[PDB]
Structures are given as C-alpha cells and as structure tokens.
Amino acid sequence: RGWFDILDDWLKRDRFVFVGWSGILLFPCAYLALGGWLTGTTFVTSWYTHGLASSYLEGCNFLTVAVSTPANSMGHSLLLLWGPEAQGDFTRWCQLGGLWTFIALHGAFGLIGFMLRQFEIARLVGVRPYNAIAFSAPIAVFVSVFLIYPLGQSSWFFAPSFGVAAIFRFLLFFQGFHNWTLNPFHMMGVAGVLGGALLCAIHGATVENTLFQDGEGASTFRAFNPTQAEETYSMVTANRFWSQIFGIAFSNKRWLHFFMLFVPVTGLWMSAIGVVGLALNLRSYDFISQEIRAAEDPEFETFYTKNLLLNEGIRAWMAPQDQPHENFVFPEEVLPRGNAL
Amino acid sequence: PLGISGTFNFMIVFQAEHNILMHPFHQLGVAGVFGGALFCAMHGSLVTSSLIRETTETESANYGYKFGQEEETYNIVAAHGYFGRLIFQYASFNNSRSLHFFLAAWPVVGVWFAALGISTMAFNLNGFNFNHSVIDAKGNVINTWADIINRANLGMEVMHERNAHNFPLDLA
Amino acid sequence: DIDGIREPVSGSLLYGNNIITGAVVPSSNAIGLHFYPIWEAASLDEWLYNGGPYQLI
Amino acid sequence: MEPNPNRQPVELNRTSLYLGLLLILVLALLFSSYFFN
C-alpha cells in the first residue's frame, strides 16, 4: 500500500463525477477541445486561412460560426503554439489556424480518455465492456474523417472545419468532388444509422406498448421498480405482435440487444472505411459501362448521369471561393450552366 | 424517384432549391437519426454489458435467455450503476419504462420534424439564408461558411434539368 | 419523360441500368398533379412514356 | 491415436442461417453493380 495504491484509491472514490486514472487523460483533453471550440467560435477569425468571418465577434450566428482549418500552405503541420510557424505567438497562432489542430488533437486524446473511462468503470462495477467496444465506432469516424482524410489530401485545410455550416459545406464538397452518395461504404453507413434509429424507435415503442399492468395509475412509469426480478413488458405478446404484423419477430432478448449494438456500430465502421478511400481520392465516382454508353449515345440518360452534371456545377461554382489558395479565375463563359439559370 | 440514384438526385436538387441543410427541422431530423443510432448502440451495449451469467464460455450467451421466461435477463441496477458513473448519476435512467419511452420518443419526434421540414419546404418556406449577412465597415461582403454553401447550391441550381428552364427564375 | 421536355430518362435494368442507377422514374411534368391512371392513356406505350407506373405505384 | 480433448462441436441455428444468407445476398445486391462497373 504505497503511493501508487494511495493515488489509485483517491482516483477511484465514488464521487458525483468519477475521475479514475482515465480522468487524467480525459478531463484536460476534453475540456481543452470544448473550450478551444467555444473560444474560437466566439472570438477567432478565419480571414487569413480561408477568407471567412467565423466568430460571434465578427457577426456570425450559432449556425455559421466555426473553428476553421489552417491555410492549405500549412500542409499537415502540427501547428504547435511553440512550433516554427507561430513561434510562441498566441495571436499569430490563432490567425494561422492553430486552434484547429489544437481542437482535433486534444479531441482525439480526449476520445481515447473517454473510451479508457468506459473500460475503467466497467471493470470497477464488474460489467462486460461492450459500451467501450461500441464507442470504437465514434472513434473510427472521428479518426478517419478528421485525421486520415486530410492526411491523404494536400493539408489540414480539407478536413472539416468545426462548425455547423462548415460541416454542411463538407457534405456538399464530398458530393460534388467525391460523388460520396454513390459509395457503397457510405450506403452501408446510412443503412446502419437509419437502421439503428429504426431499432431505437421500434424497440422503445414495443416495450412501452407491451407493458404489464403493474400499478393502478394511468401514467405507467411509476409501476416499475429497478430492483424488481420480473420483466416489465411481455416478450411473448411482443413476439406475437410482430410475427403477425411483419412476419418475423425477436424471441431472444439477448440477441435483440446485441443486434442494437451491432447495427449502428457496424454502419459507422463501414462509412469510415469509405472515407479512408476518399483520403486518396479513391472514390466510387463512376460506373465505367454507363460512361462508355453515354459518351457514344447522346440519347442515353439515367439518374446517375444527371447527378454527375450536378457535381460538375458544384465543383465549378464553389471551387474559386472554397479553395482560395488555388487562385482560380473561371471566366463567366466557362461556367457550366443549363438553359436560362 | 423510386430508385437509389434518383433519391440522391432529389436530395441535391432539394438542397439547391431550399437550402435544407440550413433548415432547423432537417437539423432536428439529423439529431433524431444520429441520436436514434447513438441511443440504439448505447442501449444495446448497456443491456449486453449486464447480462447475468447463465452460460459457459463455449456457448453463446444468448442461450442464457429463454423466450417467455418471467425473470429479467440483465441486471438494470448494474447497468445504471455503470452509466450513472460514466457521466453522473442523475443523467442515467434507473426506470426501464422511462428509458424505453425515451428510446421511442427521441427518433420518432426528430423524424416527425424531418417529415415536416420536407412538407413545409414543399411550400417554399426554406432553410436560413445568411447569404452576405456579414459586411465590413465599407460595405465589402465578408463571406462566411453560409456563403460557401451558397456557391455549392448555385452549382446544383444552374445545372439541374439543364434543358427545362426558359426563364431566369426557377419558381417551382 | 420525367421533365415533360421529350427527353426520356432510362430507369430500368434492361434499358441500361444497374441496381444503383435504376429507378421507377416520376411521371411527366406535362401531367403535373393530374391523375394519370392506365385508362387515361391511349395505350400502354403512351402510359409508359409518360411515367404512369410511378403514379400507380 | 489418443483423441484431442479440445475438440468442440459447432452450431449454426436456423435463424442464424437466415440472417447470414440475408447479409450475404444483400451485400451482393449492393456490391454487384460495382463489380460489373
């Protein structure tokens, strides 16, 4: 019972906010990621890196504020406050985008801390660590999209900027440049997100609608006791209901709840894999058979050819302002447009 | 359209014409389905984490539950004990009926707002428009991310149905 | 002809689509919100040209 | 000669067969367009 074990004791006290050994990584990293976001969105510009206003101080609202990525000329610089770009100058570091790598990197360490916290608590309380296991999906998304994607591109400039409108810009960029809707890894992501939202709704509604009458109240929440042995709702009646409505039904509650982990977790992990390909511009952009046919046959048209026309408009119309380091000048006469518009 | 690519076509054109991403009912929709997925995984993982030992390691733990048994198959008290410490005690549900109601309500209400976003953009009440909202002391436009969105939207608008418009405004 | 401009869009597998590109294509902009059941068309061939299956479905 | 005591039998129940065949078939229906390109 030396200092290590005494520290262990204190870290693990049962308090309002549990700490743990994981807390030593988690709390500072999460606090700084969140504080850096609130600080930048409130006070910091993106004039020098993007040519955008991005803070309440400049007149943006909650939808348009962001902490934006550094200039493309920074490449993948760590952009450390004491590094060769900012050279210890906190003001210049803000102006160069240092808050972006600040938030992304403390955010990444903070997510590691959070998952260690899920393991540490599961271990103390004596439960299996499936919550931590499930959290690997948020981690695969954060790491693929905020780190691997820009690392395969020219610079952090092309990572998502931390902001509501900014993230919307990132969605529309992926459509126009990567045709990311066409990508079967994104499509599996969608199915596991929408599938998970479906499972969340249908299971909550099923339990609430197959409840046992366990009190006299017409408001039925009080007729449950945490320590009760008995199921609060009828699996047998639920099972019959869905067997007869939909054709199949769950009959095994352990399977049901495992599947609820599996589906959205698996979806997120699939979308992450697609984004790793996009880091390299390795897209599902085209169906070659479609293009060969359409090039030779000017009457052949599908919704697939239509969406590429939209993509070509997005790229030509947005690139000069979205990618200012390229100094694009596209004369009016080259801009792709249909009739009238 | 009834088809995979045609669905994306409908989305991109909807973005051009209504700026749906900047609409709060679609934002509630996203919170509803991302949150439905999050809570689905959360509930899955917490129930799974607290299954009561009923099986050996060479068999699926699923065999530990029998269809129609009267006794609950996991320990809610251990699950809450876990999740209340993950965050803090009062942020965790100790009432299964409350929890399940929340699982029903969160995705359903968000998705009702998504549906209502589409159904009200149907009458052209559109997403927030902050195009040129930020102006300097002289009157120069200082773009924000809303203006970058606007340029992507313009690309969609000018290209869609490239032979169908004869007049300068796309009014329906 | 989804947009009513005599520019027909191919939705089906046998007319050059795969599962991802394929669709049943919306009815013609010339129709608008008019109800277009099979018996309003002079023929199945017309009904198909104008996107009648979309409304039936 | 002496048998291995670590042997275990393996099981796939019918529901798992159905779930698995659905996964496989749906994945194939999804990826087939890309394999033909």
Partner: peptide, 30 residues
C-alpha cells in the same frame, strides 16, 4: 448477364423472406 444477376439475387432474397417467415424455427415458451 448483369440484369440476370441482379434479378437472380433479388429473387433469392424474396425466397428467403418466404422461408424466414413460414419456415422459421417456431418460438417456444420453455
């Protein structure tokens, strides 16, 4: 060949629905 393949996979999935519903392992209270 491609169309045949797509329709073939679809028809298998429809058959699978039939067996999964009408020839499911029956749920038993036990």
């Amino acid at each position: 060949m491609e169309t045949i393949t797509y329709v073939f996979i679809f028809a298998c999935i429809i058959a699978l629905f039939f067996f999964a519903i009408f020839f499911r392992e029956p749920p038993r209270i036990t």
